[PDB]
Design a protein around this nucleic acid. Structure first.
Ligand SMILES: [Zn+2]
Lengths: 83, 52, 121, 50, 200, 117, 86
RNA sequence: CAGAAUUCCGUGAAUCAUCGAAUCUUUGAACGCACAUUGCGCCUUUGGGUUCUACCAAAGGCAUGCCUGUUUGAGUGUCAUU
RNA sequence: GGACAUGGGUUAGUCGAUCCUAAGAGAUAGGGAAGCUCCGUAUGAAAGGCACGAUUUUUCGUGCCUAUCGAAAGGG
RNA sequence: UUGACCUCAAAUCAGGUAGGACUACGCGCUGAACUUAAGCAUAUCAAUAAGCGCAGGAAAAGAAAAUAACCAUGAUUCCCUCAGUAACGGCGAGUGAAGCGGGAAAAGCUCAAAUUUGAAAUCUGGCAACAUUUCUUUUGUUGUCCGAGUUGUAAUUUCAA
């Protein structure tokens, strides 16, 4: 019987946590993340998924190195020691 | 290996196929005695080396 | 409070043993923190942690400067000692090989350069 | 279950630590907009889904 | 000069000499890999014309590409829509097999810039092309004022962007009324932009 | 003269890496030393009872410390020879080590000398 | 841990035969003997030769793996290769 | 909130600004092989201890394609020497 | 009170994982494909070892013949 | 038997390089249907959305195998104009450029095809010196050995000659 009975037998995870995006979207049997496409080289990114794109694009994380480059550019990529 | 087979089977195609005369004329070369005589003359006129 | 310049005028062995002593003091202070410590000791924890950072920084500067001296005037130097501006800049043509010209172009510019001129009213 | 993986242990350990009430001294700071934890979680109501 | 004699011989493609050389060489190229390096150009005169120099940093790769048109990868040949889009077999690809040759050779040697390419041989199943490649990371290339231009990053994958000679042809890049619709997007975007100025 | 129908590729000389420079200017200091192994002892009531009964110290230990590195760190930090080490990862994700000291030493004096009682 | 495989440590680990030393150093026998004469490297027989040499008891010469390791970083071997190139 | 202080005859407070020296855990194009396994290996050097043929630890390494060169080869490919 | 708040709590050479292979997934070789990738798994691959010798014209001769992942109920 | 050369391999070989992300704008590839036609199949939507590959601060294009038919103009790009025009269309719905003219900006050139032949004059790399610096991080010059190269690297010439 579909419905309340069938829901009882749901105790086997089909997806687990991804090692690249940390989301519970890694299909265990396919060995592929439904979110980012891991273990492919490229990231899963579709132009019809504009909202999905902005949820995880650049700037949504720490941006640690790109902030460093921005500060270094604004002074001209200088090296050495100030007097 | 494949490169060895390719060398040897290439030699066989040149032996089997009908070679045009412009290419087949290169299969008849200078004789041994004349070749040695020619190279004896040439070695007297080798060009100067980089050091010289 | 350890002063970084006073650190700079010490030896590597002296810095190493001071680092070990500072680590021992930090360990004892953390023991106080778990056993119940006073505000003075908890305030000394941060100062000890910063002193260890200063010791480790001074050691690193000496090690990297020694590496720079050893690799000075060498064709190949360690990657961390090389420039790191941007990946694209590193791949770019250098000004020397950007200014390379053929003998044809050198003669043309030698004999017919852009003259400075002006017009009368 | 009793049979775990270390990654799950780590995920549960963080999630257990994040499920705690606010320190009281936080609320006394000037300009504080925090009054209670917006991210509380009960083991029956909302699941981790990890 | 031997290059004049080589050029005229390459023009006489139905001669018994060139037929024999085409047959023997096409057999050998088919026994080797689909993308295999050429130690030296097979048509040294043709390579020199296209920009090849016999010095360090110049590389030549031979490749064979399958002949014929393009069949849609649609499953079981089933299209969905109006019958004007229903054909699947007699379709054709908009880039020449020479352009496909450069793409695959360029992808194979991802550290080299595709200078140019030339047809060397063909049969019923394959066309054989030789792709000339330049090393932008070689000092012999970077110190050469004649070929420095390809070292600049604007020349990354000229073959992929259709900036080669056969690539410009495939895009219809030319001068005059016969090449009016090209570049397609730039021309189309100019004619379909609605210019609404201020005082109108 | 070949007596085998297979052609195996010949062995060639394989020179070992002799780099013209070091990829790293300076080798990193040992990133897991004795002080980073031992964070602080645990002083709960259960820990105290283990001190007084099993002659076992209880330490908050770094995650990547194994039983070997815990033993050397304890020996170097405290000059006491452990006879056994038992570790667990606590539900909060921190390693806890039960360091059973030798019969010649008592954990009580070691605890007082550390000062965490 | 696991059942450690027999022959992974002890005599079978510290003793190395002459042929295995040749493979280890990538030297010819003539080059290996020259290095052994120039340096101080002589055969060292084990107490349990059968255990050291897999299971066989055929006469083989044993060298310390430590000695063969030390010969890896000897500049004379490079000079032998450079002379062969010359 | 505690706490110190910097005297105020300064090399110096600060959740300050600025930033050219460093650090930068586990990852990820992710690179020794893997990975719902803190899983499985290998190479070089070094060190440790009541224990030294054992065990352990540390540091530096080992992905694929391609280019220039180097070294070592292969071939009833072309030939001389003989 | 399985609620709420503060603390405490899970110790292994021997129990599991780890190791093995199953159905099956799956890189490499190669071939397709505009491509994303597809097919492929000892295939049209130079796919790796082992022992002898006063040391061999002090430039090495002579013999001898298959990744990986996949089981906390299988094997151990 | 030694060697030479060609071809093909191997190395944790010496030194390099490619991937991935962003993708508003840029270069391609591939490619619809809703919709309009008061139905609908050509048409339209549309050389569009989605899919794929590849760049830069712009990209592309660019010094005529170009217009014109004049008293001729003179690389490309963009703007206004040509012009909703010529033309294309179940000549139906609908679609649709270019020359000239005005302006913004302007900049030209490089090879292959030639015997240096009284002299490969060319180039990479190692090593050793000096030198220079957004910079002990950068960039070189000189010397000298190995090599690449005559199946062609320099100088010389590019149709305007
Ligand atoms: Zn993911």
């Amino acid at each position: 019987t579909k419905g309340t009975q069938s829901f009882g037998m749901r105790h086997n995870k089909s997806h687990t946590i991804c090692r690249r995006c940390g989301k519970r979207s890694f299909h265990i049997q396919k060995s592929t993340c439904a979110c980012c496409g891991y273990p492919a080289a490229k990231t899963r990114s579709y132009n019809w998924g504009a909202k999905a794109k902005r949820r995880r694009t650049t700037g949504t994380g720490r941006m640690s190195y790109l902030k460093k480059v921005h500060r270094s550019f604004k002074n001209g990529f200088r090296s050495g020691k100030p007097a | 290996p494949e490169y060895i087979r390719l060398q040897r089977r290439r030699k066989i195609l040149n032996l089997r196929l009908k070679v045009p005369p412009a290419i087949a004329q290169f299969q008849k070369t200078l004789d041994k005695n004349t070749a040695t005589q020619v190279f004896k003359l040439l070695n007297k006129y080798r060009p100067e080396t980089a050091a010289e | 409070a350890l002063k970084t310049f006073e650190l700079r005028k010490q030896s590597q062995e002296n810095l190493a043993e001071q680092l070990q002593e500072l680590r021992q003091e930090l360990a004892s202070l953390r023991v106080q923190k778990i056993a119940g410590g006073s505000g003075s000791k908890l305030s000394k924890i941060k100062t000890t942690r910063k002193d260890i950072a200063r010791i480790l920084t001074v050691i690193n500067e000496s090690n990297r400067l020694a590496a720079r001296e050893a690799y000075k005037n060498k064709k190949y130097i360690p990657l961390d000692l090389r420039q790191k501006k941007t990946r694209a800049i590193r791949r770019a043509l250098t000004p020397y090989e950007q200014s390379r010209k053929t003998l044809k172009q050198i003669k043309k510019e030698r004999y017919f350069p852009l003259r400075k001129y002006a017009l009368k009213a | 279950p009793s049979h775990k993986s270390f990654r799950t242990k780590q995920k549960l350990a963080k999630a257990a630590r994040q499920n705690r009430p606010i320190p009281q001294w936080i609320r006394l700071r000037t300009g504080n907009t925090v009054h209670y934890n917006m991210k509380r979680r009960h083991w029956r109501r909302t699941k981790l889904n990890i | 000069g031997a290059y004049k004699y080589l050029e005229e011989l390459a023009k006489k493609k139905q001669s018994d000499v060139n037929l024999f050389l085409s047959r023997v060489r096409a057999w050998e190229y088919r026994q080797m890999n689909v993308i295999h390096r050429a130690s030296r150009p097979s048509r040294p005169d043709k390579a020199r014309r296209l920009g090849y120099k016999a010095k360090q940093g110049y590389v030549i790769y031979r490749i064979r590409v399958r002949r014929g048109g393009r069949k849609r990868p649609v499953p079981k040949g089933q299209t969905y829509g109006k019958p004007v889009h229903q054909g699947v077999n007699h379709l054709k690809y908009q880039r020449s097999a020479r352009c496909t040759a450069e793409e695959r050779v360029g992808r194979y040697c991802s550290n080299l810039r595709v200078l140019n390419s030339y047809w060397v041989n063909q049969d019923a199943t394959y066309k054989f092309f030789e792709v000339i490649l330049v090393d932008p990371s070689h000092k012999a290339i970077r110190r050469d004022p004649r070929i420095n231009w390809i070292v600049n990053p604007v020349h990354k994958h000229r073959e992929s962007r259709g900036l080669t000679s056969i690539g410009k042809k495939s895009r219809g890049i030319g001068k005059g009324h016969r090449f009016n619709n090209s570049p397609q997007h730039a021309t189309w975007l100019r004619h379909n932009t609605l210019s609404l100025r201020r005082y109108r | 003269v070949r007596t085998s129908t297979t052609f195996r590729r010949p062995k060639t000389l394989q020179l070992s890496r002799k780099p013209k420079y070091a990829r790293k200017s300076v080798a990193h200091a040992p990133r897991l030393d004795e002080y980073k192994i031992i964070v602080n002892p645990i002083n709960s009531e259960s820990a105290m009872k283990k001190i007084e009964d099993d002659n076992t110290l209880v330490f908050h230990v770094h995650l990547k410390a194994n039983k070997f590195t815990i033993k050397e760190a304890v020996r170097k930090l405290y000059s006491v020879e452990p006879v056994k080490i038992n570790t667990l990862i606590r539900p909060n994700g921190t390693k806890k080590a039960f360091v059973k000291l030798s019969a010649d030493a008592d954990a009580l004096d070691v605890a007082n000398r550390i000062g965490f009682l | 841990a696991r059942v450690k495989q027999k022959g992974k440590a002890g005599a079978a680990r510290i003793y190395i035969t002459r042929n295995q030393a040749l493979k280890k150093l990538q030297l010819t026998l003539a080059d290996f003997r020259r290095i052994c004469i120039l340096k101080g490297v002589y055969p060292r027989e084990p107490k349990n030769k059968k255990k050291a040499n897999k299971g066989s008891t055929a006469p083989v010469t044993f060298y310390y793996t430590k000695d063969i390791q030390y010969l890896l970083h000897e500049p004379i071997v490079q000079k032998f290769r450079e002379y062969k190139v010359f």
